[PDB]
Amino acid sequence: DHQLLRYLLDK
Amino acid sequence: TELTPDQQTLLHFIMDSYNKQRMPQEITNKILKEEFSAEENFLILTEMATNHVQVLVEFTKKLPGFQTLDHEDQIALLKGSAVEAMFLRSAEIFNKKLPSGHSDLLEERIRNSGISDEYITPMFSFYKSIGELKMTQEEYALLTAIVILSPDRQYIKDREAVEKLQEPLLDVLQKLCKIHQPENPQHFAELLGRLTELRTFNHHHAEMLMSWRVNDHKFTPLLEEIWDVQ
């Protein structure tokens, strides 16, 4: 649901 | 009017990330090198769109006052502004006639990519129109940030904490529309018109994704995410 975007915002 | 020392950094802090990251030559080079088929065209456009969602998260990453907002709010924002930022980024290319854009060929692949006609017309019109404004990189970068940080978005939570971030940028755009464009007052109001037009394309787009989806057209995991389930 937001796994990929949340990841990208925590890099 | 000019620009307070506090707003003098908003222009730089923003105009920095805007140049800090561009698209890989290996990708934008395919617009020219690769063949011109309805699949190869659609495939290349998917590639750019996907690679661009990253630059977006990165650019939108910084944006002062951004990492302060609720995590269930940064997502809504990135999702609701994905396509609009992308649309505004391509407009810059066709208008700036950038060398790495290959707009002449790009416009080719675009027109022949399974895209409906109803949506192919408005698309270029917006391009010719917005093009006529002879916008400046500073106008593009600020307008984009303005687009990304739009309270009015859907599934938002603290719509009030967003307006506290967009309003500042909006104030720095007008000042420029009075400083670098005194001869015409409406400039600022010209640029804000682009916010409602971009929004019109979100509507066109949700639909052109359906046409694609029914045709066994898949998108990357990342784009599927941002555009919701593909």
Ligand SMILES: CC(C)c1onc(-c2c(Cl)cccc2Cl)c1COc1ccc2c(ccn2Cc2cccc(C(=O)O)c2)c1
């Ligand atoms: C999924 C794919 C088929 C797609 O669906 N709708 C759109 C679509 C269309 Cl056809 C028009 C407008 C918006 C979208 Cl989403 C797209 C991808 O189309 C584009 C076209 C141009 C784009 C992009 C992304 C970037 N650019 C330009 C660019 C070139 C070089 C460097 C940079 C940079 O990042 O500085 C940008 C995507």
